[PDB]
Design a protein around this ligand. Sequence first.
Ligand SMILES: O=c1[nH]c(=O)c2ncn([C@@H]3O[C@H](CO)[C@@H](O)[C@H]3O)c2[nH]1
Ligand SMILES: O=c1[nH]c(=O)c2ncn([C@@H]3O[C@H](CO)[C@@H](O)[C@H]3O)c2[nH]1
Ligand SMILES: O=c1[nH]c(=O)c2ncn([C@@H]3O[C@H](CO)[C@@H](O)[C@H]3O)c2[nH]1
Ligand SMILES: O=c1[nH]c(=O)c2ncn([C@@H]3O[C@H](CO)[C@@H](O)[C@H]3O)c2[nH]1
Lengths: 167, 169, 176, 170
Amino acid sequence: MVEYHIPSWDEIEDAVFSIGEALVKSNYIPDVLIAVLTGGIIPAKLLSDLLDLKVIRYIDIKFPVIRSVYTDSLEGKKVLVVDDVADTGETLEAVSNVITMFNPAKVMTAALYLKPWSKRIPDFYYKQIDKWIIFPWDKWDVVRENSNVPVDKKERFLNLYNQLLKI
Amino acid sequence: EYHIPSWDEIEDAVFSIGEALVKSNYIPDVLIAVLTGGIIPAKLLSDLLDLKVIRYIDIKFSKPVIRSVYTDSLEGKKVLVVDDVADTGETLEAVSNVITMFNPAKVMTAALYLKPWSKRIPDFYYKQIDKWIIFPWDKWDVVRENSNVPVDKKERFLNLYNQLLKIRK
Amino acid sequence: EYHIPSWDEIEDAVFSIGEALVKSNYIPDVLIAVLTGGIIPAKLLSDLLDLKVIRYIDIKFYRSVGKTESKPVIRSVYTDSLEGKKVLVVDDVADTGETLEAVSNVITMFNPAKVMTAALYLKPWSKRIPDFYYKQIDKWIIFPWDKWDVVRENSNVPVDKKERFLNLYNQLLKIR
Amino acid sequence: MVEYHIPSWDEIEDAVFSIGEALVKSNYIPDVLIAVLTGGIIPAKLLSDLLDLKVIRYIDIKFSKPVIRSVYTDSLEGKKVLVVDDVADTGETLEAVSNVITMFNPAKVMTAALYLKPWSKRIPDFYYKQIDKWIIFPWDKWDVVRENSNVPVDKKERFLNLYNQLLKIR
Ligand SMILES: O=c1[nH]c(=O)c2ncn([C@@H]3O[C@H](CO)[C@@H](O)[C@H]3O)c2[nH]1
Ligand SMILES: O=c1[nH]c(=O)c2ncn([C@@H]3O[C@H](CO)[C@@H](O)[C@H]3O)c2[nH]1
Ligand SMILES: O=c1[nH]c(=O)c2ncn([C@@H]3O[C@H](CO)[C@@H](O)[C@H]3O)c2[nH]1
Ligand SMILES: O=c1[nH]c(=O)c2ncn([C@@H]3O[C@H](CO)[C@@H](O)[C@H]3O)c2[nH]1
């Protein structure tokens, strides 16, 4: 495609496999995943299942503004911050900066996709991409802004959307 | 060498800050208590000005370390950070920095006591002091961290501490 | 995936900048070369326009996996007074545009008469368009003066004289 | 009241002692001093001797807004930096210096001036005293006398004789 990258769940799985394999190759097995809410939710859960990482914590950030930090002490822990895309890099910057104030043993970052203009390059990523990424978990947000985007099941979504608006 | 405020002096420190907040027309929407030294000051200030929303940040101080941040969204709120003493000023700096990341409408700071060398001056404080302060709520910590500390009820404390050490895991 | 300019093209890029400078009636009193990618462009531009005053700024923008910060870092500024001078900042590529932005910001504190910027190549996503540039390019550029860094850091890099480079790199390892 | 504050060298030493004591108590021992040239020259050297700080670097800046002429330093990355000047009047100079030094990505930049005026836009992190009138320092007293020869400083007669010889040979 030319404007959009619309990864299948199959590709999302392979992105996570790719980051997992790179973590193992680097010998960086995090003690704690910090999922960036809410784009990093699904990548962090899949990565957790893949590598059997039992400790996931969360930071609610909107873009960046912190709304909440859901974690206990990280002192002396190896942390991996997980997001779905690093576009401007501002989110990873803000999250790295605040997590560093918890004095972890180490902070590394991971994002499934990287834009070529990001001010922060994740330690781990699957693909650098210069198109707008429509993820399986924000496809309806994208459709609500632009109905033309070429995603599956749009008809069923649009029927539901119309019923919602009637409320 | 020590300044050892009575609880009566602590009450007057809180009144002074509450009076300053009202004079300045800065009535915060949210108090952020610096744990654990800011606990008592924040509760007393909250009681005094009927400030119903208190949130908390667990920070310990060669650098301040954040252990947890106990708060919901602060966006668009007027926040007042509350601690008991600003000494190096590193704690207020660290807390102000992280709270600013929550995009509050405003952040101001308060400490009961200020040391004259602090790297961060609070917006509100009661007294500038150059002695080490023994607070009523950390007097036993000061006893445990020093050789010979002149506080009331020390002999009752030491008898209890002796028994605590005898049975500790 | 790479744009790999010949030295012939680099010369033409510098000509193109010099031609644009003259067309804009902006003949710099001082070139500020961004070290170290702007070194060779600034020297060639100086020879072309007979600009005798080149000064330097050591600035890096770490954007690698493992070596990453959000902003460029100045290490040193090699210049004396620029007050009242027309300055041109010269670099080889503007990618994010942060480097040109940072250098412009610091040079402005020297109260020049004017600061303008030039880069041989511009990426489509730069935050600001340099005042002068040769071409907008979206491929990763391999310059003649950082081709061996690219070879050391990336796989399957197709550059001329790679044979001679790897032979030397082999010898370097034996004494490193 | 008095027109000028005219500190003795004894007072300048005490100002430097005061700042040095505050640096130690506040847990900020600098890795590098950045002396603002040329008023911060003598304060920085005295502070360096007091605290045994071996790394002094320099910035040539003059003050509509401050103008940097040169920055005499190598990499400051990861270092604790203290900027040192003699007086903060508008605060524009410390603002400009802090701004450029921050671009060197130090671990931290803090500022110090011996004296602070109340209308400064920037309050230095460390200072000795607040003053709300003109200060004549031991190191710029002759510049002041050249503007107004009535200012009450010592050794003025010797200076004026020298100054008269200088005015000739031009
Ligand atoms: O679905 C997205 N695809 C992208 O390529 C992309 N690039 C940037 N963003 C933004 O990331 C922020 C995360 O907090 C959101 O505001 C998105 O607009 C993106 N969202
Ligand atoms: O009891 C204290 N007295 C002080 O003067 C003082 N200055 C700094 N501190 C630190 O502040 C914490 C409580 O807010 C203490 O545990 C000290 O680390 C002080 N604690
Ligand atoms: O060889 C490069 N090609 C590029 O397309 C490119 N885009 C950005 N950079 C950065 O600019 C410096 C040289 O001025 C390099 O060291 C990269 O950090 C590039 N380097
Ligand atoms: O001797 C000075 N006394 C002042 O009160 C004062 N206020 C501002 N300045 C400026 O600071 C420079 C020395 O650091 C002087 O040359 C004045 O420009 C002052 N210089």
